[PDB]
Amino acid sequence: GSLNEVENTAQKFCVKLDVAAFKPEELKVNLEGHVLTIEGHHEVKTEHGFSKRSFTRQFTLPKDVDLAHIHTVINKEGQMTIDAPKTGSNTTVRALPIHT
């Protein structure tokens, strides 16, 4: 889970991880509040010993990330991208319904 890039603009948040050493089923992505946690665990046995790999990478997302629309995808080259739009990106004038 080598952290390739951090991305933080007005319109979206995005993080990219190197997860090529782990298969999709060996990976977990969890969110609690603003805290995002990615983990990989690989564990093979043999009759000549064994192999084991692991990583945990955790970060706190910006206050204004729209956690409701977080999307995580792993591409064909084993790179994970986790992205979401910002809450206050919509800069036009939005009328709010007044409830009576």
- How many C-beta atoms lie closer than 10 Å to residue 37's C-beta? 13
- Give the whole-angstrom CA distance, residue 6 versus residue 27: 20
Within 5-24, the residues that bind a second copy by CB under 8 A are 21
In this complex, which beta carbon is closest to a second copy, that of residue 6 or of residue 89?
Answer: 6
Q: What CA–CA distance (Å, rounded) separates 77 from 98?
A: 49
Q: Bridge-partner residues for 34, per DSSP?
A: none
- Token match 């955790």: residue? 58
Q: In this chain, which stretch among 30-38, 67-75, 79-87, 90-98 interacts with a second copy, using CB under 8 A? A: 30-38
Question: What residues from 35 to 74 belong to the interface with a second copy (CB under 8 A)?
Answer: 35-37, 46, 48-60
Binding site for a second copy (CB under 8 A): 1-3, 21, 35-37, 46, 48-60
